[PDB]
């Protein structure tokens, strides 16, 4: 990868930015640029590539075979009872949360059992996260 | 990888930035640039690449075979009972949280059982995180 | 990898930045740059690469075979009971948290059982983290 940048606020080549309650008087500028970028990414000069796969079974006897794939889940349990009794009193709540399995991002590729691969593979993730905000 | 940058606020080539309650008077500037970037990334000169895979079974007897994949889960349990009794009193809450399995990012690649791979593979993650904010 | 930089606030080539309550008067500047960058990353001159894999089973007898993958979980348990009784009194809370298995980032690659690999592999992670903020 090339130039995978995360900028918090602002990005530029040249910036003359002026913000607040300042004062200019008689400012002069100038700029001369000769930029050039000969990207030559991910090029191939191949004569004979032979991917392959096979299986040969002869005079065999096979019984009770099991091939699971990854990331299984079984017999899980969640129990979040919230009981509230009360009598002749005073209560008050604010910004109460109960969270179970709260996802944000799930990126999956080549999640297989068998995988012959030739080439490139990328996974990029840029974000600004904030779960709870109260006051 | 090339140029994987995380900038907190601001990024530039040249920056003349002026912020607050300042004073300019008779400023002069100038710039002469000859930038150039001959990226030649990830190039191939291959004559004969032969990926492969196979299996040969002959006059065999196989019984009760099991091949799990990675990242299994079984018989897990969570129990978060929240009971509140009360009598002739006063209560008050603010910014109360109960979190179970709160994910943000999950990036998975080539999560397999068998994997023949030829080439490149990347995984980039840039972020600004903040879970709880109260007051 | 090349140029994997984490900058807290600001990044530049040249910076003339002026912030607050300052005073300029009759400033002069000048700049002459001849930058150049001949990246030649990850190049290949290969004549014959032969990845491979195989299995041959003959006149065999195999019984009760098990091949788990990595990162299993079994019979786990969590028990966080929160009981509150009260009588003729006064209570008060603020910014109370109960967290169980709170993830932020999970990056996984080539999490396999078998893996023939030829090439490159990267995993980059840049972040600014903050869990709880109260007051």
Author numbering:
A (entry chain C), B (entry chain A), C (entry chain B): 120 to 254
Question: What did the paper state?
Answer:
However, we found that TMEM106B forms amyloid fibrils not only in the diseased brain, but also in the brains of normal elders. Moreover, cryo-EM structure determination of these ex vivo fibrils showed that they share similar structures, in which TMEM106B adopts a curling stone-like fold composed of residues 120–254 that originally form the luminal domain of TMEM106B in its native fold. Thus, the structure of TMEM106B in the fibrillar state indicates that prior to forming amyloid fibrils, the luminal domain is cleaved off at Arg119.
The PDD patient was in the late stage of PD and manifested severe dementia symptom. We then were able to unambiguously fit TMEM106B molecules into the cryo-EM density maps and build structural models for the fibrils from normal 2 (referred to as Type 1) and the major species of PDD (referred to as Type 2). In total, we obtained three types of fibril structures (polymorphs) from four fibril species extracted from the brains of three donors: Type 1 fibril in normal 2, Type 2 in normal 1 and PDD, and Type 3 in PDD. The Type 2 TMEM106B structure fits well in both density maps, except that TMEM106B dimerizes in the minor fibril species of PDD (referred to as Type 3) via electrostatic interactions between R178, K180 and an unknown density. TMEM106B conformations in Type 2 and Type 3 (dimer) are nearly identical, while that in Type 1 is moderately different from the other two. The fibril cores of Type 1 and Type 2 both consist of residues 120–254 of TMEM106B forming 17 β-strands, which are arranged into a curling stone-like fold. In contrast to the identical N-terminal handle part of the structure, the stone part of Type 1 and Type 2 exhibits conformational variations. The protein segment (residues 174–186) forms a hydrophobic hole in Type 2, in which unknown densities were observed in the fibrils from normal 1 and PDD.
